[PDB]
Design a protein around this ligand. Structure first.
Ligand SMILES: NC(=O)c1cccc2cn(-c3ccc([C@@H]4CCCNC4)cc3)nc12
Length: 339
C-alpha cells in the first residue's frame, strides 16, 4: 500500500493511463496489431519525421511522392478499413502532430513496462519529486489568481477550474539549470501539453523538436514555447468533453535579454546577447500587477492593451532554444468547463 497523498496517486494513474494511450492510437487510425504500444521505437519515430520532411521537399519542388507516402505508412502502419495520399499541408501537419504525441506515448509505455504498490513503483520511474500545494497557502492563492486573471477574452469555449496544484522537482534539473539560475528576467510561465505526454515530460523534461521533423508550424522555429496567458497554453492540452481534465505546467524560464518580434521568424541561432524570443501580443498582463513568487516574476495581472497594434499575435509567447533554460516548478490539474 502506497503512502502517497491521494491527489499524487490520482495524478500517477492519469499519466500512465494505457487506455488513454490506446484510445489516442485508435483516433490516429494506427493499426494496434501491426504497431502495438510495445512496438513503438525512438528510431522508428525519428525516421518517420524524416519522411514527412522529405514529403514536403518533394511537394514544394506523382510516382516520387507516392513512394514517400507509402514508406511512411510502412514505417507507421495504419488501419483505414484506402490510405489518404500525403500531398497537402494539412495532411503532413496531422501526421507530425501524431508523431509528436507518439514520441511521449513511447516514453510513457517504455517506462511502465520496464511486492510494492504499482503506483509507488511507477511514481519512482518519473524521477520527479511531487508534493501537493495546500489550498490555504500563499502559493495556492498566487497560482489561482494567475489562472483567474490571465484567461483570454477570445478563448471563450471553456472556463478553467483548479483541481490540484503540485510542486515538482525533476531529478537533475537543478544541476542542468545552474548556469541560468542567476540570469536576469526569470519568469513563471505556462506550458500546456496533452495528458498522454506528461510521463515523457516529467521523466525527460520539456524538449525541442528533433532536426528530422518538418520546420513548418513553428512560428519562432524549433524551441520550447510558453505563454503568460493561461488559456493560450490550456488550448494545447487538447482537452474535450470526452476528457475535460487537463495538465498544465508552470516553469521558471530564464529569458534574459528577449529578442522581441512582432511576426514569424524561424530562429536557427538567436542574435548574440539575446537569450530568448518574446512574440509580442496585442494584450499583455498589466505589468504593475507583477508579483514575486520566491524570486521569480509572476505576470498574473489582468490583460490590458500592450499598445503594439502592428503584430501577428493576439497574446505574448516566449521561446527558449536551450532545454537547460527551463526549471519546472508546478504542475496543475485543471477542469475545463466547456460551454
Ligand atoms: N504549449 C504551450 O503552452 C504553448 C504556449 C504558447 C505558444 C505555443 C506555441 N506552441 C506550439 C505547439 C505546437 C507546435 C507545432 C504544431 C504542428 C506540429 N508540431 C508542433 C508549435 C508551437 N505551444 C505553445
Amino acid at each position: 500500500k502506497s503512502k502517497l497523498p491521494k491527489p499524487v496517486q490520482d495524478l500517477i494513474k492519469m499519466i500512465f493511463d494505457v487506455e488513454s494511450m490506446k484510445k489516442a492510437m485508435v483516433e490516429y487510425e494506427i493499426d494496434l496489431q501491426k504497431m502495438p504500444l510495445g512496438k513503438l521505437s525512438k528510431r522508428q519515430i525519428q525516421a518517420a519525421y524524416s519522411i514527412l520532411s522529405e514529403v514536403q521537399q518533394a511537394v514544394s519542388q506523382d510516382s516520387q511522392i507516392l513512394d514517400l507516402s507509402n514508406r511512411f505508412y510502412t514505417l507507421i502502419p495504419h488501419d483505414f478499413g484506402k490510405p489518404p495520399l500525403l500531398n497537402n499541408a494539412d495532411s503532413v501537419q496531422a501526421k507530425v502532430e501524431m508523431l509528436d504525441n507518439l514520441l511521449d506515448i513511447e516514453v510513457a509505455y517504455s517506462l511502465l513496462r520496464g511486492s510494492k504498490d504499482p503506483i509507488d513503483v511507477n511514481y519512482e520511474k518519473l524521477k520527479t519529486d511531487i508534493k501537493v500545494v495546500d489550498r490555504d497557502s500563499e502559493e495556492a492563492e498566487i497560482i489561482r489568481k494567475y489562472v483567474k486573471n490571465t484567461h483570454a477574452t477570445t478563448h471563450n469555449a471553456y472556463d478553467l477550474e483548479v483541481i490540484d496544484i503540485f510542486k515538482i522537482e525533476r531529478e537533475g534539473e537543478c544541476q542542468r539549470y545552474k548556469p541560468f539560475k542567476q540570469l536576469h528576467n526569470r519568469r513563471l510561465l505556462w506550458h500546456g501539453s496533452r495528458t498522454t505526454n506528461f510521463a515523457g515530460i516529467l521523466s525527460q523534461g520539456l524538449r525541442i523538436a528533433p532536426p528530422e521533423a518538418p520546420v513548418t508550424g513553428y512560428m519562432f522555429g524549433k524551441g520550447i514555447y510558453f505563454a503568460d496567458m493561461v488559456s493560450k497554453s490550456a488550448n494545447y492540452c487538447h482537452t474535450s468533453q470526452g476528457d475535460p481534465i487537463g495538465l498544465i505546467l508552470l516553469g521558471e524560464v530564464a529569458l534574459g535579454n528577449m529578442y522581441e518580434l512582432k511576426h514569424a521568424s524561424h530562429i536557427s541561432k538567436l542574435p548574440k546577447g539575446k537569450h530568448s524570443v518574446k512574440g509580442l501580443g496585442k494584450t499583455t498582463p498589466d505589468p504593475s500587477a507583477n508579483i514575486s513568487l520566491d524570486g521569480v516574476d509572476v505576470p498574473l495581472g489582468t490583460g490590458i492593451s500592450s499598445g503594439v497594434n502592428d503584430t501577428s499575435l493576439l497574446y505574448n509567447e516566449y521561446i527558449v532554444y536551450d532545454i537547460a533554460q527551463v526549471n519546472l516548478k508546478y504542475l496543475l490539474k485543471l477542469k475545463f468547463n466547456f460551454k
